[PDB]
Ligand binder design. Structure first.
Ligand code: CDL
Ligand code: CDL
Ligand code: PC1
Ligand code: 3PE
Ligand code: 3PE
Ligand code: 3PE
Ligand code: 3PE
Ligand code: 3PE
Ligand code: 3PE
Ligand code: PLC
Lengths: 175, 99, 98, 96, 115, 83, 347, 171, 51
């Protein structure tokens, strides 16, 4: 049912994580993180944040494109490993999906599960707000306050990105 | 804060985002604004040792609004009971609950 | 604590367990750090968007800004490791003994 | 030209927002009755479903305070059909 | 619903075209036909060998600048605030620091590809 | 004034893109501090009614608050209709 | 490295730490650590040799993992309290992650394996920052969240640190590895008194910094990084060996030296809270520290190890090292016990 | 704890205003000029009472006044109004810009046959004052009694008795 | 305290600088032609490429 779209996207979100957490060739690990970024954008986008969902997808699409170039230069071998070529990779991949299956199986059967925290399986739609906003997007108004309210945040992040460029040149200088 | 430069200098560096009942753009309220305000006003100036026991009612309502644990349990029981009655043909849903 | 929070918190645990169990490639571990940041971004965005905490809506963006700095910093170190040994294997990083 | 037309666009926006501001009292009044009607219908139906449960008290509040708490989506559409629940939850986000 | 159905149709059409491509034509597969292409002579080594990136430093810098678009894209909404003096100050400060980063890397020969 | 003109001509002959960049950016920082219309941008943003104007309970001692929308009291947008 | 760039990166390290101390919002605290790690690593890579690359990489991997756990704690604390204030956390699971994240940053046992290796792989000046300045930010956070810290977790880490630090320091001949294991052991004393009196955590941190900064300054003066290299100091700078003796005896907690004060005050607070078995165990286990400080005095000041002929050439040149604040630090690290009641200024 | 009190379905019964969104937007400016007092009364009740159950009676007078408003349009301006809101209804954004000629015909009918003057720009966004006999709520949040503050410490600050009293120290 | 595990440990270099590893630069060899538009048909240009 489409009422569980958020839950169905979060299952793919975990499956993508098991994709790169099992650590095959970073080429295939990068693909797994793109799938998680794509569905993660979908999950966030269904809670009312379209800018946040599209932005994280946009940032991670460029992030894994640099990682792809770095994988062909410094993280490549003759036979890049897939989720089936190695027992250690395959073992961790099957284990991740089985735990995902059991958690999904129990939450949809009992409507509850207790692991550190107590989770509810009624559906994500039961916690949404029943009132409408006005003529604006609340997420957009909060993000636009960074420049009027977040003067201190803009300075530290701005300085951090500046020093970030200085640092990477220093680290990679080699002399 | 370990060093309270903000309070002495009179500069607000990060206090404006610490609570969700503070001033927001366009006076947009948070869903648990009333509950947070009550817990903050109950436990003002009395220390966390006292507030942990004397403002326990407000803080439990505030946590109920935040995570809705007790409401979802209540909905679960009603929904579970309705299925049991329907599964054994003992309850007819009304029209406005079906269409 | 809806059923979505379970999967998001499980994603963080998977990426954490993935980061703490190295295979060979330093690049494979760097992906797990970027995976963990993604989980924290999603989990924070969900909580903030659901509670209508308007001003907190910028926090997830500020979380991505400093995730890139770390990711760029981790890549810069990976260049120098590769230039010294010809691979990004972590078993070569053992000249220093505890 | 661009700044002259954008200036006119701001005045057309204020007019549009004032049209909403004229209707909000009527819309708010309707919404209050609609929300209260739905809650009562769930209360009249919780009584029949939960008549046999031993310790159940129909309409009990989960909060200590007697203040009005805005119902969340589950409380308001707890027992209604999935078709109307789907539009009340994702109707706006999905309308493109 | 509409967006999801639009995506399903686009990738279903793409998939069906690929399926037809592999099942409609007559195939004659043999070893030499599917060998890797290197202009007529056998490749000397594996294509999976390391491939040096001479613009690695510029690629790292792309990660940092690609995060400025996330911070800069809210500007159209930021201009709607009542605190224009503060908003315009931090908008220009943020863009200027982005420019100083470019100036530093440019002057320090950071944008030049390694030999 | 002679040696400085040499610098400008030299850059204008070798980095015309950068000369245009710095000139454009300099105007962005300077003109707003001088334009008389900058104050109206603040007023237009403040005059846009996103929220509902919640009425004030009338205690009988608020002469500057209108009782009806079309009363003379209260802020006026006559300036905006001519700006 | 350009001197201006070194100064800017140095100030960025301080700014990150200062942001953590003045921040009242959790997000800013996290930003402080991220800024601090961003600036520290280039100072570790300054000499650009394979050991420095390994040290920086091991340091980055550990610190990056800790910052992820700290952000998880902040978000979990946000879900259960709906506020970002830097105070006691409102969820037990958030406290454990934050406590462990702060333990990894400090290098407490059993998260200590990087401290001996990172310190060995970087120069002495970079090591001094690693073992003195990097401890201010994590200790700032523990000082503010201690009411919610699980008592068993924090005391367990403290006890393991005192044990591992003492044992690890016995099998070492490298000064940077000796100072590294000494640091781990001293972290235990700071965090052991944390649940009972956070003021004494500040006292031990201040005294530990002064003594630690004094040892590195004296090792930096002679460019000594090994026990045997330090064994030639008596034949070049005899005065420097006496100062090393007094400081090392102070670090061992022997009265009437300054370093006895933090142990003495920490035992007082724990015994007031009816904690008797732990202070006794901590004091006795600290004798492991005093043993491999005594072993350094023996080969440095109390005996005269063999010299080499070329040493005679070093007699004709003075010490051109800056040795900033060394005369002041050595005095504060040895003669401060009569001023012990001045610990009240920290309150 | 406690039972949530809800009105009966008879308390929520009222004659609805069954007109589409294009009808409301076409008449919004005149509607907000004529029905201000019952509107602002109800809107003050919601923000002061913070409870929809405490403003049902005011919420009915909003409906009653809106009906009388449209009945007057239905008696004098029936045809010009229909053309106006038909043209607003055509646009996806319900823009005012595209119906000025039809708006003028609607504005002149009410001006002559009813004396209604359209509010100027910025009028309906004004914060106004409303007279009401309804008492001001005293505890709208249903707050409990705030805990008593810690006994404040005040007085003259004398020197520490016998100094620090730290072990053997005399000062 | 020597043990069997630490029998092959040796003290680090006096200046923290380990010898650089034996040159293992792996240039990429590519056939540029003969069947190549820019090879003029019958040129087999074997090129060692770094990037
Ligand atoms: C006096 C009161 C005593 C009170 C006692 C209480 C305890 C406090 C005292 C602690 C003792 C600290 C000093 C230790 C000795 C320093 C070592 C030394 O001799 O220098 C050699 C050594 C360099 O020798 P080298 O390795 O051969 O060459 C390095 C380069 O390769 C060379 O490359 P180059 O040739 O291009 O040159 C680079 C350039 C570089 O120049 C500098 O070194 C300047 C560094 C910036 C310091 C600026 C002063 C701080 C205040 C500035 C105001 C803004 C601060 C906020 C910034 C954010 C706001 C924007 O020049 C230098 O290197 C100058 C030589 C170093 C002199 C350092 C003098 C300042 C240290 C004392 C002040 C502490 C500063 C905070 C520590 C920084 C942490 C990262 O110095 C260092 O690199 C170490 C720096 C110090 C790190 C340890 C500092 C202690 C950390 C604990 C905090 C203590 C305070 C809080 C707790 C206690 C109070 C309650
Ligand atoms: C506000 C109240 C602050 C009270 C302290 C005022 C004096 C501090 C500034 C003097 C200074 O340059 O030392 C900073 C510092 C001294 O480091 P140093 O190289 O180890 O000093 C010994 C040299 O041989 C120094 O020899 P030099 O030939 O290179 O220079 C002679 C120096 C001689 O200056 C001195 O007397 C050095 C000793 C003064 C600093 C003592 C540390 C601060 C005292 C408080 C710490 C003890 C706490 C109290 C005891 C424990 C609790 C009761 O006289 C001056 O430079 C006059 C500067 C006037 C400005 O120089 C810097 O690099 C930072 C600037
Ligand atoms: C869902 C999967 C979509 C992607 C399918 C891509 C694809 O079809 O490639 C053919 C690939 C490539 O296979 P192949 O290259 O070995 O040869 C394909 C044709 N044969 C086997 C006859 C020589 O094969 C498949 O995986 C086909 C999967 C079955 C698709 C349905 C077939 C219906 C035919 C009518
Ligand atoms: C519950 C969590 C544990 C689930 C089981 C996960 C183990 C799955 C099997 C596996 O990972 O491989 C077994 C591993 C040896 O694998 P392998 O990489 O082939 O070692 C020799 C390579 N030259 O050997 C192991 O280390 C398995 C340890 C368990
Ligand atoms: C099967 C896994 C399992 O059940 O282990 C649970 C174990 C005990 O924890 P707990 O559930 O609180 O105690 C019993 C209460 N019925 O707790 C565990 O061992 C679970 C291991 C969790 C590892 C957490 C690593 C740090 C990340 C913490 C974030 C929160 C993650 C927990 C929620 C995800 C659940 C899938
Ligand atoms: C309830 C909530 C549950 C939350 C936890 C979910 C975790 C599910 C598993 C998905 C995450 C996968 C972790 C990554 C595992 C890994 O990378 O293994 C690396 C390690 C190195 O192996 P290798 O270098 O290839 O040499 C062969 C040695 N056998 O390979 C190995 O040594 C053996 C690999 C075994 C992989 C099984 C990991 C599951 C147990 C982890 C602890 C669970 C907590
Ligand atoms: C505005 C900042 C003005 C500074 C220059 C910014 C543009 C970068 C120019 C770099 C190239 C240059 O011409 O200057 C080089 C400068 C001088 O050093 P020099 O020895 O003469 O030559 C370089 C040797 N490698 O070498 C240097 O030391 C560069 C030092 C600057 C490094 C970048 C940091 C800029 C300072 C921040 C400016 C913005 C203010 C931020 C405030 C927020 C603080 C929280
Ligand atoms: C109030 C807030 C606004 C102010 C913000 C403060 C920051 C301003 C700077 C932000 C932009 C960062 C870049 C600034 C440095 C300029 C780039 C640079 O570093 O040039 C160094 C240049 C290196 O080139 P080189 O290899 O030496 O060969 C040419 C030699 N002539 O060596 C050189 O020869 C350069 C010679 C000096 C160049 C001066 C450039 C000044 C730029 C600012 C001018 C703005 C005003 C102009 C517009 C007026 C209004 C129309
Ligand atoms: C590649 C990109 C860069 C291209 C070069 C940039 C352009 C050259 C720089 C000077 C011009 C900048 C301003 C841009 C044009 C402004 C708009 C315009 O020209 O229209 C004139 C307009 C007329 O008034 P208006 O009220 O709009 O009348 C119709 C209203 N219905 O006027 C207005 O409405 C607004 C009046 C304010 C105009 C702003 C400029 C005045 C700034 C204060 C004086 C300082 C001038 C600079 C001198 C100091 C710097 C050297
Ligand atoms: C590699 C794969 C990892 C494991 C994934 C889980 C597979 C087993 C699921 C069994 C649970 C069950 O019986 O539930 C089945 C549900 C069906 O959806 P629902 O919305 O809950 O409909 C049921 C509730 N009704 C009747 C109210 C509508 O399935 C899921 O939603 C699983 C997530 C989608 C699969 C991933 C894409």
């Amino acid at each position: 049912m489409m009422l569980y779209i958020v839950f169905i996207l979060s299952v793919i979100f975990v499956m993508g994580f098991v994709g790169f957490s099992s650590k095959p060739s970073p080429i295939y690990g990068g693909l797994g993180l793109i799938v998680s970024g794509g569905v993660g954008c979908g999950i966030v986008l269904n809670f009312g944040g379209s800018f946040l969902g599209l932005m994280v997808f946009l940032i991670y699409l460029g992030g894994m494109m640099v990682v792809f170039g770095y994988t062909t230069a410094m993280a490549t071998e003759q036979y890049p490993e897939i989720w089936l070529s190695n027992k250690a990779v395959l073992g961790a991949f099957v284990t991740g999906l089985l735990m995902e299956f059991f958690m999904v199986y129990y939450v949809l059967k009992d409507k509850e599960v207790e692991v550190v925290f107590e989770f509810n399986g009624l559906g994500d739609w039961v916690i949404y707000d029943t009132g409408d906003s006005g003529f604006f997007s609340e997420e957009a108004m909060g993000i636009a306050a960074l420049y009027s309210y977040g003067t201190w945040l803009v300075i530290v992040t701005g300085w951090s990105l500046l020093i970030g460029v200085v640092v990477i040149m220093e680290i990679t200088r080699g002399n | 804060p370990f060093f309270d430069v903000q309070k002495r200098l009179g500069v607000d560096l990060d206090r404006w985002m610490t609570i969700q009942s503070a001033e927001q753009p366009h006076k947009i309220p948070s869903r648990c604004h009333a509950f947070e305000k009550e817990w903050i006003e109950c436990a003002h100036g009395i220390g966390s040792i006292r507030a942990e026991k004397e403002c326990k009612i407000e803080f439990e309502d505030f946590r109920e609004c935040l995570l809705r644990q007790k409401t979802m349990k209540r909905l679960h029981a009603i929904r579970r009971q309705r299925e049991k009655l329907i599964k054994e043909g003992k309850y007819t849903p009304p029209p406005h609950h079906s269409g | 604590m809806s059923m979505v929070y379970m999967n998001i918190m499980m994603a963080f645990t998977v990426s954490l367990v993935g980061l703490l169990m190295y295979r060979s490639h330093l690049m494979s571990s760097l992906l797990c750090l970027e995976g963990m940041m993604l989980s924290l971004f999603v989990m924070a965005a969900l909580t903030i968007l659901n509670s209508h905490f308007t001003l907190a809506s910028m926090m997830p963006i500020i979380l991505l800004v400093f995730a890139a700095c770390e990711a760029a910093l981790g890549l810069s170190l990976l260049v120098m490791v590769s230039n010294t040994y010809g691979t990004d294997y972590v078993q070569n990083l053992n000249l220093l003994q505890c | 030209s661009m700044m002259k037309w954008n200036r006119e666009r701001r005045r057309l926006q204020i007019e549009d927002f004032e049209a909403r501001i004229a209707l909000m009292p009527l819309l708010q009044a309707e919404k209050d009755r609609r929300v209260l009607q739905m809650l009562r219908e769930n209360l009249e139906e919780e009584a029949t479903v939960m008549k046999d449960v031993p310790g159940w008290k129909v309409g009990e509040s989960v909060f200590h305070t007697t203040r009005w708490v805005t119902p969340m989506m589950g409380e308001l559409y707890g027992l209604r059909a999935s078709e109307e629940v789907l539009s009340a939850t994702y109707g706006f986000i999905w309308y493109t | 619903m509409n967006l999801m159905l639009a995506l399903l149709t686009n990738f279903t059409l793409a998939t069906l075209l690929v399926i037809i491509a592999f099942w409609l034509p007559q195939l004659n597969v043999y070893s030499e036909k599917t060998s890797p292409y290197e202009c007529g002579f056998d490749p000397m080594g594996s294509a999976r060998l390391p491939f040096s990136m001479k613009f690695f430093l510029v690629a790292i810098t792309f990660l940092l600048f690609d995060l400025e678009i996330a911070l800069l894209l809210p500007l159209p909404w930021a201009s709607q605030t009542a605190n224009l003096n503060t908003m315009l100050t931090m908008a220009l400060f943020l863009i200027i620091l982005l420019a100083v980063s470019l100036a530093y890397e440019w002057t320090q020969k950071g944008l030049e590809w390694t030999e | 004034a002679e040696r400085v003109a040499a610098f400008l001509k030299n850059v204008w002959a070798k980095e015309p893109v950068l000369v245009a960049s710095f000139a454009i950016a300099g105007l962005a920082v300077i003109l707003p501090t001088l334009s008389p219309y900058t104050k109206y941008s603040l007023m237009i943003n403040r005059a846009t009614p996103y929220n509902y104007p919640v009425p004030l309970r009338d205690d009988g001692n608020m002469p500057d608050v209108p009782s009806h929308p079309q009363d003379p009291q209260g802020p006026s947008l006559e300036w905006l209709k001519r700006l | 490295m350009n001197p201006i760039i070194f100064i800017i990166i140095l100030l960025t390290i301080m700014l990150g730490t200062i942001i953590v101390m003045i921040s009242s919002h959790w997000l800013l605290v996290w930003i402080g650590f991220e800024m601090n790690m961003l600036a520290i690593i280039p100072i570790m890579m300054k000499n650009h040799n394979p050991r420095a690359t390994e040290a920086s990489t091991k340091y980055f991997l550990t610190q990056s993992t800790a910052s992820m756990l700290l952000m998880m704690a902040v978000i979990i604390n946000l879900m259960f309290s709906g506020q970002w204030t830097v105070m006691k956390l409102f969820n037990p699971m958030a406290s454990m992650l934050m406590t462990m994240a702060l333990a990894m940053k400090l290098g407490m046992a059993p998260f200590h394996f990087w401290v001996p290796e990172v310190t060995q792989g970087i120069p002495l000046s970079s090591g001094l920052i690693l073992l003195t300045w990097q401890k201010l930010a994590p200790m700032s956070v523990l000082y503010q969240i201690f009411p919610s810290i699980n008592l068993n977790l924090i005391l367990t880490l403290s006890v393991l640190s005192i044990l591992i630090g003492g044992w690890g320091g016995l099998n070492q001949t490298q000064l940077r590895k000796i100072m590294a294991y000494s640091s781990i052991a001293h972290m235990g004393w700071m965090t052991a008194v944390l649940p009972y009196n956070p003021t004494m955590t500040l006292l031990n941190l201040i005294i530990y910094i002064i003594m630690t900064s004094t040892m590195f300054t004296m090792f930096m003066a002679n460019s000594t990084t090994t026990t045997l290299s330090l064994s030639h100091t008596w034949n070049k700078t005899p005065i420097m060996t006496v100062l090393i003796l007094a400081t090392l005896l102070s670090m061992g907690g022997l009265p009437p030296l300054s370093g006895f004060m933090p142990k003495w005050m920490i035992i007082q607070e724990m015994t007031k809270n009816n904690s008797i078995i732990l202070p006794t165990f901590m004091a006795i286990t600290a004798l492991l520290n005093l043993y491999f400080y005594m072993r350094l005095t023996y080969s440095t000041t109390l005996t005269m190890f063999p010299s080499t002929n070329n040493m005679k050439m070093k007699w004709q040149f003075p010490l051109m090292k800056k040795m900033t604040f060394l005369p002041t630090m050595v005095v504060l690290s040895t003669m401060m016990l009569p001023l012990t009641p001045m610990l009240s200024v920290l309150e | 704890p406690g039972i949530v009190e809800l009105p009966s379905l008879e308390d929520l019964k009222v004659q609805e205003v069954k007109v589409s969104s294009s009808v409301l937007k076409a008449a919004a400016h005149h509607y907000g000029a004529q029905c201000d007092k019952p509107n602002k009364e109800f809107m003050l009740c919601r923000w002061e009472e913070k409870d929809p159950r405490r403003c049902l009676e005011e919420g009915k007078l909003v409906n009653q006044c809106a009906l009388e408003f449209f009945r007057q349009i239905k008696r004098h301006c029936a045809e010009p109004f229909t053309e106006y809101w038909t043209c607003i209804d055509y646009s996806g954004l319900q823009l005012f810009r595209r119906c000025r000629k039809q708006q003028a015909q609607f504005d002149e009918c009410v001006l002559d046959k009813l004396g209604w003057v359209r509010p100027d720009l910025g009028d309906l966004s004004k914060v106004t004052k409303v007279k009401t006999d309804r008492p001001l709520p005293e505890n709208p949040y249903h707050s409990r009694a705030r805990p008593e503050p810690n006994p404040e410490v005040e007085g003259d600050l004398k020197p520490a008795r016998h100094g620090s009293r730290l072990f053997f120290w005399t000062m | 305290y020597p043990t069997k595990e630490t029998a092959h440990w040796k003290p680090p270099p006096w200046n923290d600088v380990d010898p650089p590893k034996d040159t293992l630069v792996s240039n990429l060899t590519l056939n540029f032609g003969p069947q190549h538009p820019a090879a003029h048909g019958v040129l087999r240009l074997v090129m060692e490429l770094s990037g």
